Paper text:
Two glycosyltransferases (GTases), SdgB and SdgA, are responsible for the glycosylation of S. aureus SDR proteins such as ClfA and ClfB. SdgB first appends N-acetyl­glucosamine (GlcNAc) moieties onto serine residues (O-glycosylation) within the SDR domain using uridine diphos­phate N-acetylglucosamine (UDP-GlcNAc) as a donor substrate. The subsequent addition of GlcNAc to the glycoproteins is catalyzed by the second enzyme, SdgA, yielding glycosylated SDR proteins in which each SD repeat is decorated with GlcNAc disaccharide moieties. The glycosylation of SDR proteins mediated by SdgA and SdgB protects SDR proteins from degradation by host proteases, thereby circumventing innate immune attack.
Despite the biological significance of these two glycosyltransferases involved in pathogenicity and avoidance of the host innate immune response, their structures and the molecular basis of their activity have not been investigated. This study reports the crystal structures of SdgB and SdgA from S. aureus as well as multiple structures of SdgB in complex with its substrates (for example UDP, N-acetylglucosamine or SDR peptides), products (glycosylated SDR peptides) or phosphate ions. In addition to the dimerization role, the inserted domain was found to serve as a binding platform for the SD repeats before and after glycosylation. Altogether, the extensive snapshots of SdgB complexes in multiple states provided a mechanistic insight into how SdgB recognizes and glycosylates the clustered serine residues in the SDR proteins.
Residue numbers in the entry:
A (entry chain C): 0 to 93, 98 to 178, 183 to 317, 321 to 500
B (entry chain A): 0 to 307, 312 to 317, 321 to 500
Write the structure that this text describes.
Amino acid sequence: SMNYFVGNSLGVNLTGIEKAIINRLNLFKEMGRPAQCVFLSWNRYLYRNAQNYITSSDYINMYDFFQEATYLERNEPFDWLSYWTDECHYTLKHHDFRIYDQERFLMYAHFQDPKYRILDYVNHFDSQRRKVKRDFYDVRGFLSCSRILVDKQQTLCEFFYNPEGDTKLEKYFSYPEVQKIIVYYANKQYFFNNETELGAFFIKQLYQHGDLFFSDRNVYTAPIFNLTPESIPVVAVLHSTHIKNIDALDSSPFKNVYKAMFENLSRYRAIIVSTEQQKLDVEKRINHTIPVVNIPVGYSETIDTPVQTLSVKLISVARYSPEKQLHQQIELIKRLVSYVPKIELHMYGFGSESKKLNELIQKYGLENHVYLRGFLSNLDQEYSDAYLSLITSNMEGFSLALLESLAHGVPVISYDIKYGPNELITSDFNGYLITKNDEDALFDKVKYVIDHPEVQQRLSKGSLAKAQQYSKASLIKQWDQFVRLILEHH
Amino acid sequence: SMNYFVGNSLGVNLTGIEKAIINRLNLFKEMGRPAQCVFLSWNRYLYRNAQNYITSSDYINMYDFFQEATYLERNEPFDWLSYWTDECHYTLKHVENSHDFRIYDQERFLMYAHFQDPKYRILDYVNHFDSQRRKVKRDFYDVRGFLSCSRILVDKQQTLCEFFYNPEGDTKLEKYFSYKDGKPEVQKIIVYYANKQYFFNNETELGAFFIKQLYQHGDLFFSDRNVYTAPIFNLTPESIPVVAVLHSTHIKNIDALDSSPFKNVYKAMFENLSRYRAIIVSTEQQKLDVEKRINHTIPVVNIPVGYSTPVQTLSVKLISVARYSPEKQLHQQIELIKRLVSYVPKIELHMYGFGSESKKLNELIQKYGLENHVYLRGFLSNLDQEYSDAYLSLITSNMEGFSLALLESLAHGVPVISYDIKYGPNELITSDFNGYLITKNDEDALFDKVKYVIDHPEVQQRLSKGSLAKAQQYSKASLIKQWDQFVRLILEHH
């Protein structure tokens, strides 16, 4: 039996949903449940984006599947520049080349590398210099898609190839929308009107009696699951707030990304959310129509670095976005620095709010007190001397960063806001929950913990215990039980 | 060494050039010189058109060559209907008064299928539709059974590009089109050959590449459809030996031998004579005019375009074997009979052929009250019975070409009276031997000579025996010896 985590693709910069999908995959292998990520969109760079995260045998892409290129890795590098000159006697006028036969302009080639071992695309031109066809190469080496052009470089149709160059899919477009898809599969021809129908066909070929699907990128996967039969079991996973407005729990419309899932609840064996708090809201909102279950989106990893070697160092691990209200922590430091002259705030993240935050810092002469540290891929060394974590957001989700900092014995002072802080913070155990936007009470609890390092030490010991509760193995056992119960009942 | 006779195609009704190519192949086969016909145009019916006349190994079509379908014969039949119904689970709906079926996956219209035969054994094409019932692609099947070409459509079913396949389904050629004067014109051709890709701007360049792939030292090419074949040979090296074959008059105006422009179909060959080893024409008379016109720059050789039951069992039966076209001037034959019937009341004239002039010919027949004297007999595939009682053949044309029809009537002992016009009458008529030649458009002299042969049956008999003797000069064995000597000589000089 196989567990499939259905997203869309993998960017250069992995997204929350992509990490969750990958994170969840690792856990299933650990406990000896087979699992695979399922990708939908055509992405001739997928194998590259995947390389530093999962193996080729750990994912099935829908286009790779019909192009017979699943589990296929990089071809041995190919000398395109040599083949064009030494075998085809063409003329190259320079990571782009213009290919001429004698005086005749044929093609526009585009490479990735300056070593020219990885071809990207080749534009083909007619006798009038009209661009008639584009050849799009997969990062693994084989020609993946040719696009036929008409009029003003308008896409008319696309042909997708297997590695050996057989046609496996055809797409036909009008204005640029798909009106027809042809697939060559199982020694015949299949016809679809759109990519959702193709996706549904793909899911039916994947499924074997006893497998389980997870719907992770609902804006794409729910419409696909909606056209598959009810004998194929699938669970919906929400990675965010389920409604546009969390303060109108009964009334708020579902997020657009979750609409097609919520409007066909009966198709799904369950909904998974990250927090008990979110499970209670969702359960009540859908009148218990299907099971809702809370399974955290990560775990506290075993500690490899020195812990609480304690200058008072406060930290923020948070995207530089409006919702994290990070200026409130700069203002906190403005207040505290008169009582705590050697105080330091380190804020780890990136995003829109950098310029404004940077300006607020210079404005208050806090350049020796508050540091916008940007993104660090490794935070282990940053936690060893951290006195406490701050959360000043108007909204949250289950925070992997918070779990990591707790596993390092760094206690946390957070607003009590949905979702995540209530799950990972017990007041006076591993930190303190504060009424949302009460900056005065924030100052009082931060000052109190700084004034009483015996308190910080005791909250440190609570932090290590809270992290122990969210271990890799507790999370394994929760996935293991859920999967067996969902399949048992199906 | 291989002799290659390069034409365009074979139609369902063979043209003059197609027959000339096939007759030449048959002579080379009898002789023991390897020959093949070479065809250029994409023609997914070529195999059926060819079956009555040549074997698969007797020809190489250009498209078949690149489609890895040269020498391929017919597939065992395939019941597309059962495969669509039983194996694909599609819904078939017959179209009223047709061999056509609409194909559906449930409520969804997917394809329109056309069969050649009401038994649905020969799939011809399949049209594909998108979700908005736009016709996006047409699949064209070869008569041998394989999918030959897919054509991709845009806008009002305009041809954008075409993909040509081997029998296994691999793409071997692509063609890209742009519209000019309301018709698609090739702007690009890609060919997958010898594990490489090759690029061309037009079919002339593709043709030249094809010739270069066939040629081995010792081989010899004949350019028979010069409007297409000459521009192709013009793009090939002079190391490849090619003979130009003219199948009609070489100039637009036969009466200005020196100054007339060449026929548009021969312009490319005459504007590059030094490319060609020789020119072949069907008549000694055309040979002398062409040699003079080109100042003997290359050799010109006349080789007839073809070779030659009970006989002369004799009512007085005149015959005309001639297209009903204005150049033939068949009205003059009506006028001749109008004048003759007075003196010869048991006279008949049988006119074998067809064309746009039939209506006027019937009007004149009716006008002259000649309905029991002049017969418009239509085309006749076989004329053997029609010859046995024929007294005399008539030719009243203002222009001619070498006539296999006239050769055949001469083999059957039928003498002829013809206007003296170029080309063909002087080749097959020696005055007072097998017939008479009359000043062009001299209807009085035509009457007088026709009347003299009717009034002298012993003269008719001598001319008949001269017709048998004239035809025997065009024997299979004399054509073989001309062709054998020509190829020997051409290859020695090259």
